[PDB]
Amino acid sequence: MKTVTVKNLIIGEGMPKIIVSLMGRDINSVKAEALAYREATFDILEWRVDHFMDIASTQSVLTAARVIRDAMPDIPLLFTFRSAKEGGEQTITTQHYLTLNRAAIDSGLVDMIDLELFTGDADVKATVDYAHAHNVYVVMSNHDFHQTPSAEEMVLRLRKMQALGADIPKIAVMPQSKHDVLTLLTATLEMQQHYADRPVITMSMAKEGVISRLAGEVFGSAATFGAVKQASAPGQIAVNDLRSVLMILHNA
Ligand SMILES: *[C@H]1C=C(C(=O)O)C[C@@H](O)[C@@H]1O
Ligand code: NA
Ligand code: NA
């Protein structure tokens, strides 16, 4: 296990780390979210950049990042543009996506970025090396908002993210059945049994999938998303409820 340390937080041992997603259409609403969010307890702040309207301006995006870092100087910060094809709020060109992600890395404002595996091998491997050259960690991610791939497919996808240099492979899948939820947990456990080189984030989305967000210490998901007031993805529960369950499981 190559654990990831960001500001005294160790991702990939002990209790799963709680992530909450900040969503703001503009700099003023990003600022008000950050002030409200630093009154909640969690391990990692994700800025969902795709919710930001003025995405065309690299500098406006960096101004918004700065307002979040100013509000919370010592939170581990994850810069995440979620593309619409993986369930995000808007479309941008690959080129603009890598520009924003490189801008974020160079800013020194963020500790981690999200790179979607399906961006394409050469673009991901180059952005990963770029992140790593500036000591920014990569959460390499895949989302399927429609169905749950087989356990084999999710294990090979997560190992693929490892091979392209992901610090923290991440997969989030929509169950169609309770069976699909088990499949995801099986996939998670298979990485813990057989492929435990990098911590991995797994989740089965929606109401049926919620157990996947609670059980990460047993089956080996290194982090889980709670909601401060709005959920960034369906099946997230209130961040205090999530912390309660995590602590009862760790201390059992
Ligand atoms: C990845 C996963 C999400 C989830 O299913 O909880 C939320 C999204 O903001 C993250 O980027
Ligand atoms: Na994704
Ligand atoms: Na999808």
In this structure, which residue's CA is closest to atom 3 in ligand 1?
A: 233
Say which experimental method was used: X-ray
User: Domain 1-252 class?
Assistant: alpha beta
d(CA 127, CA 122): 9
Q: Which atom of ligand 1 is nearest to the CA of 224?
A: 6
8 Å CB contact between 18 and 246: yes
Domain boundaries along the sequence of the chain: 1-252
Rounded to 10 deg, the angle between the 151-163 and 178-194 helix axes is: 40
| Interstrand relation of 9-11 and 77-80 (parallel, antiparallel or unpaired) | unpaired
8 Å CB contact between 198 and 162: yes
d(CA 91, CA 84): 5
Distance of CA 138 from the midpoint of ligand 2 (Å): 12
